[PDB]
Structure formats: C-alpha cells, structure tokens
Design a protein around this ligand. Structure first.
Ligand SMILES: *[C@@H]1O[C@H](CO)[C@@H](O)[C@H](O)[C@H]1NC(C)=O
Ligand SMILES: *[C@@H]1O[C@H](CO)[C@@H](O)[C@H](O)[C@H]1NC(C)=O
Ligand SMILES: *[C@@H]1O[C@H](CO)[C@@H](O)[C@H](O)[C@H]1NC(C)=O
Ligand SMILES: *[C@@H]1O[C@H](CO)[C@@H](O)[C@H](O)[C@H]1NC(C)=O
Ligand SMILES: *[C@@H]1O[C@H](CO)[C@@H](O)[C@H](O)[C@H]1NC(C)=O
Ligand SMILES: *[C@@H]1O[C@H](CO)[C@@H](O)[C@H](O)[C@H]1NC(C)=O
Ligand SMILES: *[C@@H]1O[C@H](CO)[C@@H](O)[C@H](O)[C@H]1NC(C)=O
Ligand SMILES: *[C@@H]1O[C@H](CO)[C@@H](O)[C@H](O)[C@H]1NC(C)=O
Ligand SMILES: *[C@@H]1O[C@H](CO)[C@@H](O)[C@H](O)[C@H]1NC(C)=O
Lengths: 323, 175, 175, 323, 175, 323
C-alpha cells in the first residue's frame, strides 16, 4: 500500500512572455527582462537646464552673417545644441560661397556660448559709403544687406586704400568673418568702387591671405549674376587681424567671442521646439529610459543608452514555462 | 532540455509554488504542501542577476555616431564616413543580438541543471530508504512527516535513524 | 564527451542504424532489430537546422568593401581607408570563425545530451523490472517482445502489468 | 540464464568529414555542412542582363576626353560596371593633370548610362582655328587630338575674345569637360594664340572659375614640355554654362548626359571580357553560389555572399563518428 | 556547478592528491592511498591547452593603430580618424574580455563534467557488488585490494570473478 | 561492519589565484594563466639593431630645412623610428608655413635611410648674394639662416633672372625642398631684390608650380612681420627639376636621397634616449613580453602583443579551489 512522498519540481506561472535562442525561437518563459528602449517623445526638448538653438528657416551661415530674414537670431548667446533644417531657405541671401564652411560648422559643434561684439563700427568708415545693399538681401520689399558685415562702396567718386586692424584684447578666441564681391564687368566695377584692379588682404600671426575679384559671365541666381565669397578665421588672444583693400572688401562689423566650449551638436530636424526637458536628445525625439539599449536614432546627445538596429532585445531571466 | 530534468522526467511544472524557482512537494500522514527551496533558488537569483549586469557593463563602452558635413567635391570621404559609421553600428548590433541569444540558451539550461542538481541531492541522501518513481518524486519506504521533511531539505538527514525500519518494509514485499 | 554518453558508457556507435541519429536495438525471443527513435531524432533535426539559419541570418548584414581612388598627396586618407576596410574584414573573419568553433562544440554536446536523455527515459520507466549492464543496454528480468518493445519507446508502458513476474525472477537468484 | 534486451545507441557511418572546435581540431564527424565558397570562374561576365564597360588599355580620362587611341569607346552608352587596368597606357595623350579626377571617378561609379551629345559644334568657331593638334596625341603616325575637346588657335593672325554659353535644356544632369594649355615661353604663346596675357573663365550658377596659363621650364614627357590641365563640372537642368577666353582655351565639343544612375563600380583587373553571365562579380572572376560566405576577393558587385578571409568554414551538423 | 559533482555531492577536494586533476582514494585491508587518474587528467590537459592556443590564434590578426597628423583646417577628418581607431580598440577589447569570460565558465564546467564522468565510469562497473554512499565513494560488499584497485581504474574489471561473493554479503543483512 | 572503499575526488591546493565569469566574479581557482602584459621599461630603446632618431627640441621641418638650433641633426642617416616632442620649440625659425607638411611627415614614416647630398652649391650663385640672414634664425646671438636652403638677395644693385635645373642621376627618389619670401612692402621688396613684381616657378615631369609673393600687413612673430613659405617634391630617377625666378626665391642647396624604405613611425614623446634594446617600442616605454595581449599604449612599433584597454585578463586553467 502507498505511503509518504516527497516531490522535486519547478516554478510555473501564467506568463505569455517570450524570448529567443539560437536553436529555437519564441520560447515561452516565466520571467523575462526587456532591455531595448523603443519609444521617444517626438519632441525637441531642452537638454538638462539648457535650451537648444533652433534655427527655424535659417542656416548657420545666414545666422552668423546676419541675413535680414534672420534678425530673430541676431543675439543668441547660450545653447545646449543646434537644430538646423535639411534644406533651410535663408542662408547666403546674396549668392556665392562660404569658404571652409563644414570646418566652421564642425568647430561650432564644440562651442555653446557666443558673445557678439562690435569690432569695427560703421563710424570708422568716414571716407567710404557703408550702404551697399541689394534686392536679394531685402527686408520688407526694400533692399538691405547682411546685418553683420558691411558692403563698402566709393564715397563721392573715390575709394581710398583701406588699412585697418583689430587687436584681440580679450582672453577668449575670436571668430571674425569677412568677404569679397565679384562684379560682372569693368563698368560695374568702376561704378561701385571707382578703382579697377583691386585686392583684399588679410593677415594675422598665422593667416596670410590675398584675394582678387574674378570677373566672369555667370547664370542668374535670385536675379543676380554677381557673387560674394565669405571667409572666416579664429583670432587668438593678444593677436591682431589686419585688413588692406582698395575695393570689393565686405568688411566685418561684428565678430563672435567664444566664451564657452563644451560638447554640442548640430542636428538635422524638421521639428520645432517642444518646450520640454530631457537628458538624452535625438533629431526625432527625446528619450526617457533606464534601458541599456535603444533603437530610435544613431545621432544622439546627452547621457544615452547604446544605439542598436535591433527591433527586439529581451533576456530570459526565468525558466521554460510549460503550457 | 540539455539536462533532461525540466520537461524531461519532471514533465510539467507547479502553478502551486510561488515562493521561488525550485522546490518540493511533500505528502505525509499529516498533509500536503508545496515548499520552495531557498538556498538553490537564491543562488540562481544571484547568478542570473550578475549576468544581466555584466552583459550591460561590457556594453557601457561601444561606438557612438556624430554628424559630419561634407561638400559636393568630398563624396569620397563622405562615403568613407558613411561606411565607417554603418560598420560599427552593424558590428555592435551583431554583438548584442548574439550575446542575448547565446546567454538566453545558457540561462534556460542553467535552470535545467539547477533542478537536476536538487533532485539528485535528495536522491543521494534517501538511497534505499525510498523508491524513485521516475517523475521527480520519491515514495518513502519508512514513514516521513512534517519534521522528517525539514531534514532531507537542509541536508541534516540522520540516515541510520530510519535505516532499519525501511529494510523490513522493503523485503516484506519480496518474501 | 561533456555528458558521458557518446564515447563514454555507450562506447562505439551503430553502422546498423540508418533511419536516424538516436535509437534502439532490442533482443527478444522473436528476434533482433535496430530501431531509430523518431521523436528525439526529429527535435534534433529541427534544432540543428534552426541553428544554421540563425548563424546565416545574423551574418546577412555585415561590412562590404568598395574601391576608392586617392592621388599622391592623399596618402594619409588612403591609409586611413585601407586600415578601416582591413579592420572590418578582420572583425567579421574573427566573428564567423569564432561563431562556428563555439557552436560546433555546442552541437556535439547537444548530441551527447540527446543520447543520455533517451537512455535515462528508458531507465526511469523499467526500474527494477530490468538490469542496467552499463553499456547502454538493459537486461529484462521479465519477458519483453515485439509489442513490449513499442511500449517503452512511445512511453506507453504499463509497469504493473509486468511488475510482479520480474520480482520473483529477481529474488530467485538470491534465495 | 540470459534473457531479453533493449539497447540505447547512436548513429554512425563511413564519413571522413571533419569539423573544428575550440578545444579540439580535426574531429571526425558523421554529417557536416560546408558554408564557405572557394571557387570562381576566373572570368569577367555580364551582370544579370548587362555587359560591363571593359576599357582595355584606356583610362577613364582617355575615354571621356577622347584620346585617339580609344575610338573604340567613342560611343558607349550602357554598362553594368567598369573595368580598368592597374596601369592603363592610354590616358592623357597630351601631358598634364585632370583636376579632381578621383572625385569624378567616384561620381562615375554611381552612373551606368551616358548619352554623349554635341554641345558646341566646330562650325561655331568661325573666327578661330579648330585644328590644334600634336604628335603626342597621334593616330596613325600623323598628329591628332582628343576627339571630344577642341584646341583653338589663332585664325589669320588674330585671336578674338571668346564668349559662348550653353543652356541645359534637358531633364538630365550634364557632365561638361574643358581644359587650358600651358605653353613653354612667350614666343610659343604668341605663335599659337597671338594674345600674350590670357585667361579662361567659366561660370555657372555655382561655379566661378578663372584660369591663367603658367609658363615655366619643364622636363619632357612624350617629347613634350608643354602641359594641358583639364576640368569638369556637373551642369544641372535649366542652368547655363558660360565660357570666356582670349587664348589657351581647350573648348568642349561633346558633353555627357547622365540618363541613368544606379549602383556600379570601377574594378581593377587585367582580365578581358569573358562572354558569360553572373549575379555576383569580383575583379578576378564571377561567383555562382548559395553559400553564405566566400573568400575569393573583398571587392564584389551584385547579390553576393559575405567575404571572409578564412580558408575553411564548416559547421558540424551530425555527431562524433567513432573509428 | 553545472554538473553537480565538484562542490555538489563530492563536497570538498583533496589537498592530498598532487599527481593530477582527477583521481581516486582507496581503502582496503592493506592500506590507504590517493591515486590520480592519468587518462582523464591528460585529456583535460590536452583540452585546456588547445583552448589557450586557439584563443591566442584567433587574436593574432586584429586592428593596429598608427599615428597620423592633421592640420587645423582638417578637424573633420581628424575626428573621423579618432573615432575609427577608438572604435576598433573598443571592439577588440570587448571581444577579448568576453571571450575570456565565456570560456572561463566553460572551463570550470568542463572540469565538473570530467569528475562526474569519472565517478559514473566507476559506478557503472561495480553495480550491485558495492554501495554508493553518496559522497563520491563506494563501499565494497566483497573484498577489494591493491590489485582489485588497478582493475576498476583501467576498466579491466572482471565482474563475474567477484559477482557471487557480494550477493551473499548483500542479502545477509536482510534475512 | 564497514569494509573496503574507493573514492572519486578532485585536486585542490593553496592557490589564491582568481578568475572571472559572466555569472560570478572573483572565483578562487587552483591554476590560472595571466595573458595581459602590464609593464614597460619606461625607456626609448633601440629597435633590434637600430638606434632611433630622437629629435630633442627640433621638429621634422627644423631638421629637414636646417634650423641653426639643430646642427646636431645635420647629418643623420639611418634610424629605426623617429621621436618628436608634442610641441617642439625649434621648427621654422623664420615664421611662415610648410606646405603639405603632414603628407611629408607621413611619407617620412615609410623611410628609414636618408643620404643628404649637395644639389646646388653656393658657388653657382656668381651673380646673386647668398648671405640672406635674420635674427629669428640666429646662432650665437648673431643672425644666421637655414643650413639647407639659401636666401638669395640682389648682388650690387641687380637681381638677374634665375634659371637653373637639376637632373636626378641616381637610382633613388630624391626629396627636394625650396621656399619663397613674403616681404612687408614695396620698399622692402626693392631693398632686397631690386625687382618689384616677382615670381618663382618650379617644374618637373609632374609638377607645374608658379608662386608669387604676397604683400600684406601682418602681426609680429619672433619680432618679424615677413613670412616664408616652404614647399617639397619627390624627384624620381632620371627626371629633372627646373627653377626660374626673378626674386624672392629661397633656393635648395642640399636635397635628400631616399636610400632605404621600411616600416617606421614618428612617435610623440617627452622622453630622452634610454640606451637600451627592444623588439617592441611604445612612446612611453619598451615592452619585453610573451603575453599575447598588453595594455600600455595603442601606438606601438615592432613585433608586439595586441593592445587592449583591459586592466585584467586571466584565463582559468584549473578548477574551482574550495576553501
Ligand atoms: C515569433 O513570435 C512573433 C510574435 O508573435 C511572430 O511575429 C513571429 O512570426 C514568431 N516566429 C515565427 C518563426 O513564426
Ligand atoms: C593698428 O593701426 C594703427 C593705425 O591705423 C597703428 O598705429 C597700430 O600700430 C596698429 N596696430 C597694430 C597692432 O599693428
Ligand atoms: C521619465 O520617466 C519617469 C518614469 O520612470 C517619469 O517619472 C518621469 O517624469 C519621466 N521624465 C519626463 C521628463 O517626463
Ligand atoms: C587537420 O587536418 C588538416 C587536413 O588534413 C591538416 O592539414 C592539419 O595538419 C590537421 N591538423 C593538425 C593539428 O595536424
Ligand atoms: C548666350 O549667349 C547669347 C549671345 O552670345 C546671349 O544672347 C544669350 O542670352 C546667352 N544665354 C544666356 C542664358 O545667358
Ligand atoms: C550555377 O550553378 C548551378 C548549380 O547549382 C548551375 O546549374 C548553373 O548553370 C550555374 N550558373 C552558371 C551561369 O553557370
Ligand atoms: C574582486 O577582487 C578584486 C581584487 O581584490 C576587488 O578589487 C574587487 O572589489 C572584487 N570584486 C567585488 C565585486 O568586490
Ligand atoms: C639644364 O640647364 C642647362 C643650362 O642652364 C641646359 O643646357 C641643360 O640642357 C638643362 N638640362 C635639362 C635636362 O634641361
Ligand atoms: C626580456 O625578459 C627576459 C625574461 O623572460 C629576460 O631574460 C631578458 O633579458 C629581457 N630582455 C631585456 C632586453 O631586458
């Protein structure tokens, strides 16, 4: 006749949780831990304390040079990161090229605090006109120009040789920008600058540049056939920048003090500001998670989990749960 | 099962047990009861837990992407840059998906080994004083009860104390 | 052997068996016969097969090289490009050679576990109604034959139906 | 006395197949699957439907500019990929440099359908000679020139200022090429172009180039000491290219319509055409395989297995096969 | 323990044994002695040794860094270069740290499997001619001594030669 | 009553050695093998037979051009590798830029044997002065110049047009360097070179360069406001380099024969020579090891173990050693 018993067995529950294995998929399990974060708030938030710089319809160049379609950004100072559109519409209002633009943008992603300062006031230009202007850089359907650089033209009928310098009396690196104008022909050249064969020279302790306008017949862009080329350098503390020109000089008025370097980024996104806060931002949304992995976007900034391309990552913790 | 225990010779598990992963179910003259082993279930918590944290730690440093710009006469370096970043992303996606698959399997078999190690621990104590039915259960030849239970479990099991009684009950069936 | 079965206590395998990977060989009063288990051999086909496909799938996306040209004042980027491409090729060569080695071993031991799990399944049924010779074989105390065979196999094995006969044959040797 | 028996055992066969493990090599096995493809047809085949462009002894530059040693390729249109030799002998027949050559080649590997079109007919040049020619660019031991660009020289004894444009009235991007010639001295300059201080200007909506010949004494190449520099741009739909010159201009005659972009490659190989077909091509041979891996060459095109450097990759499927 | 042997049912190891990794300790009418198995200990040396060399060989080709210089308007490529080199260094640091962890564990369990495979080899020979105490030790029913020892070991163990003597000693306790 | 016994057991010892596992750390073990090398001799040794070139306070440029603060290196010939400081103080003594400097340094890391040879002796310059000199390139507080290139100035009051060539009659690639000087104004220009609008031309079979001085006002560096730009080319066997100039030419005197190419490196280190020998060198110390891995520094040269970032790597060989 049957007597006493002791059994050896194992836990089970009502769990539908599944995990994967190399030899068998979709194995039902008692306990499992998901480790892949798959959700974001679809918003562009502050990063910890700090508001991003959201350029709207402006490009970095449009911002720095002061395209009239960007007066909103005339005075930005501190940002956590930068957002720019895929194809912003307001950049170089006057057509032409920005030299070493990507190198500048890269520099810019290591900076988070600019202090704009007046380097050469218009009042300096007593023997030149400062009112060079154009329909392509218009404000309210009346012709204007970049807010930050100045288009010098002949005063009366003479354009005297320019020779001005600026010494960096700060303890912060200084970003200065300038440019040159390429006219369409000699008549146009004479009408604007009087002088016919011109140059722009720029020297620091490391830069030794000489520019010369290039006449040529070009297709129209924004109705215009002329062109403007822009340049930038970093002027170090206690160094001096020197400009010489006898025509075509687009002079700096403002320059940018680099007051804080930090980690930052220039993100490409069509989104607007979301008025929210996060510790981890991607171009398509912020992340709020303790997961060690996420799969939302590879370009992130802040304290983030690790990006993987997987749509699913879950560890078995418990054991095979029999039906 | 790599160890034959779970879904092997102990087909089916116990909805009744709640206190833990591995345990017992007795049946004496007093009554019944599911009882979860603690010492074994805990060393399986400590294990699986150290696993998750080490999976995570070996992943704390891996490749991070950063946006770069290139102009229209820099297509070559641009492409090199695209390849390099897709490359590392694919490498760490392979690495994590494979680590999880490989350890998932080891985790299940770890459980299967823990169940078989518990069963065998009981079996090696009782020996001839009971019968293995082959279902993860032992029929006691002698009489066991609500303190004879707590003896096989904590390993504190005086075998000679019950050794003789069983020997007669065992041979009574034969002769 | 990690499980002691294959080339352990069942030294040597059977050229005779052809129907599958794991099976039996009986010997009754009727005659002989090798018989392959199907249920176990199939779940080892399904396993090994899912293995090959997942090895391949986790390899479907990995680094692809593309030829680039650099001029004679671009030696630095050229070299960076050479390093990057050799780098990923070496990484995926490591990855595949190691995956194969690691799973090859797991595959062999998987078989060894399947053989031991089959043996134990038989042993746990028969119990005292037969003797384990220690060679992967059982000597029946009672009499088994060409339908008593198909009972241990499909697990449909009425133990009490033969329980008593064996007990006498067993003790006849002693007394 | 002995009675009935049941055995538990395992399969075996007469297999010499071996696989490897971390703890033991050359383990003999019953069943194994090889997964590494190790053979190719040593041929350069079509890729699916499409014949490759096999440049023989010509370089990309020789082809595009129309080196007389390449008339075979004057009219290629559609290709699956491009094959070029390590060191092709027929390139720039007249010595000099091709500006941004590798960037152009890279562009070219995204294109598989060119339609050559006449952009400026020789008939246009009514007041200049079009018969500039040289022994270095010879055909049958009598001096010739690039088939696709034209060497303008003085007509009578005058070289009038050139000012011609072309508007891209197609819906396809247009590849235009041009060049400039560097003479050896002022006498030579005057003998060819009459005008002594010259320039070439080229403008589009984005390009604003000015070139100037550079006199200098140079070592001889193909007997010649003069040099020719070539340039290219992509002219977009509905844009206009503008050339001005008063000498040294090597003008475009033909330009290339980009009719189809696709994946392609420029492969380096000494092989010839193999008159065969494949789905996966490498520079040393085509591949016909279902293996997930191969080890023949890292540069492939088409639907291919994964390249690894291994000489052997075989999975155990079966079990240890005892002797 | 994944196999229940080491620190399972053979709790504690032997400071006494020096000749090798796995062995025996007998006790007869003559005397005592620790004796290391050679055939098993050697195939565990050959294994662990082939492991170290293959770990090293699969690491003989991996990424090597080289110093490059970039000027102040080449910050983009410089950074790409820094990322690429940190990337591969992190990848091979992950690869080696993980390989060691994964094989370390397999090495320990390999030992645990070797001990259990040795025990079982002895057990399957002796059978009813002795008793398993459940401590990694067998009490001989019949009498074994300093040449009966060298018989179970080398597998050369004539079972019928001692088969009958044990059967009486075994049943003497019952009747 | 108790009888005979046989035990099954396993080895143990008095080992404190520990190894790690994914599921449990610090597991005490009987036998373990360390495979991570963690020590270096903190010295810069020879590499096999060969002594490194240790540039002390000189830069590669200072060495190659012959900055007077570097006469120690006037005659180096064979080196195993190169050591240079993070920020060497003696480089271009006269301020300016070295064109394509990093490309040259990279070239240089494939070379280990230079033979300096006189290419154009000062005796050649019969109608120009060779004694251009400056305080910035001073020796013992009296003004000097680069030992390897020569500053030509006007002789009497004329600077005749220069036209000299050099043919590479060796079987080894030849490194030649030259330069141009940028004066501060026209007076200074006339005072040094008489001729006012000048050029430097350089031609080989592949190079076709034209340089022109750039006047501009610059900040002072080492008291100086003028600048010198340097250039280099590789002249192949049996080719000829041609220089033309009518002023501002800094001519080559010596050039460098490339007698042996091999693997080498330019390492950055503040260390001095250690007078020792090794097979594996890092910037912070040599390595003497059979370990397959090391963790001391990623930039190595020689037969070395594999760098990993780990602070610990030890394989279990033996078994769990119970207390
Ligand atoms: C695994 O489960 C998921 C979720 O239900 C399902 O989409 C997938 O098809 C399953 N796998 C297979 C092989 O069917
Ligand atoms: C700046 O220019 C003024 C005159 O325009 C000059 O006196 C002054 O010295 C210059 N500053 C420097 C640093 O050269
Ligand atoms: C992030 O998630 C936590 C829940 O874990 C929540 O309490 C917290 O409010 C979230 N943060 C934000 C900014 O929404
Ligand atoms: C493994 O087998 C191959 C093929 O016969 C042979 O070349 C190799 O030497 C063998 N391995 C060893 C360690 O001998
Ligand atoms: C092209 O040139 C002709 C005259 O040479 C001119 O009339 C025409 O407007 C030009 N086309 C464009 C788009 O400028
Ligand atoms: C590719 O191999 C298959 C055999 O699997 C063969 O039938 C086929 O003809 C081959 N293709 C070519 C183009 O030779
Ligand atoms: C492992 O041992 C090391 C060395 O004593 C020690 O520093 C570390 O803290 C130990 N691990 C843990 C988890 O305490
Ligand atoms: C070098 O110059 C001399 C005259 O200055 C000239 O006769 C000789 O031919 C030139 N060598 C070459 C190779 O041009
Ligand atoms: C390197 O280490 C070995 C010890 O393994 C030693 O004998 C040898 O002298 C060392 N080499 C040097 C250069 O010190």
């Amino acid at each position: 006749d049957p007597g006493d018993q002791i059994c050896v067995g194992y836990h089970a529950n009502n769990s539908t949780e599944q995990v994967d294995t190399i030899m068998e998929k979709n194995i039902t399990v008692t306990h499992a831990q998901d480790i892949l974060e798959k959700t974001h708030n679809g918003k562009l938030c502050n990063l910890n304390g700090v508001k991003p710089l959201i350029l709207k319809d402006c490009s970095v160049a449009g911002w720095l040079l002061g395209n009239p379609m960007c007066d909103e950004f005339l005075n930005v100072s501190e940002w956590s990161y930068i957002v720019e559109k895929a194809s912003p519409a307001n950049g170089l209002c006057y057509p032409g090229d920005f030299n070493d633009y990507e190198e500048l943008k890269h520099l810019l992603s290591r900076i988070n605090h600019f202090e704009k300062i007046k380097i050469i006031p218009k009042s300096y230009w007593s023997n030149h006109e400062t009112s060079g202007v154009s329909s392509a850089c218009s404000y309210l359907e009346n012709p204007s120009f970049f807010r930050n650089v100045v288009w010098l033209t002949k005063k009366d009928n003479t354009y005297p040789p320019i020779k001005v310098n600026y010494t960096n009396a700060n303890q912060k690196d200084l970003l200065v920008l300038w440019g040159i104008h390429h006219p369409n022909n000699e008549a146009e050249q004479k009408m604007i600058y009087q002088n016919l064969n011109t140059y722009v020279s720029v020297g620091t302790s490391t830069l030794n540049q000489r520019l010369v306008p290039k006449i040529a017949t070009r297709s129209k862009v924004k109705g215009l056939s002329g062109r403007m080329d822009f340049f930038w350098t970093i002027l170090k503390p206690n160094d001096t920048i020197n400009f010489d020109s006898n025509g075509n000089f687009i002079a700096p008025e403002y320059a940018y003090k680099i007051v804080k370097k930090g980690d930052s980024a220039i993100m490409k996104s069509e989104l607007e500001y979301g008025n929210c806060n996060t510790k981890c931002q991607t171009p398509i949304g912020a992340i709020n998670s303790s997961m060690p992995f996420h799969n939302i976007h590879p370009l992130t900034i802040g304290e983030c989990p690790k990006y993987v391309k997987s749509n699913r990552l879950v560890l078995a913790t418990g054991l095979r749960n029999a039906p | 099962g790599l160890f034959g225990a779970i879904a092997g010779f102990i087909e089916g598990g116990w909805q009744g047990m709640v206190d833990g992963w591995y345990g017992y179910h007795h049946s004496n003259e007093q009554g019944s009861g599911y009882a979860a082993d603690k010492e074994s279930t805990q060393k399986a918590i400590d294990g699986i837990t150290n696993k998750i944290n080490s999976i995570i730690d070996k992943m704390n440093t891996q490749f991070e992407a950063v946006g770069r710009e290139f102009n229209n006469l820099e297509r070559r370096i641009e492409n090199l840059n695209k390849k390099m970043e897709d490359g590392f992303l694919d490498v760490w996606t392979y690495n994590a998906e494979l680590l999880v698959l490989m350890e998932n399997e080891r985790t299940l078999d770890f459980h299967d080994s823990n169940v078989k190690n518990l069963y065998e621990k009981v079996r090696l104590q009782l020996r001839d004083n009971a019968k293995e039915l082959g279902n993860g259960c032992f029929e006691f030849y002698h009489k066991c009860d609500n303190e004879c239970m707590e003896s096989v479990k904590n390993g504190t099991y005086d075998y000679p104390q019950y050794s003789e009684e069983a020997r007669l009950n065992r041979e009574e069936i034969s002769g």
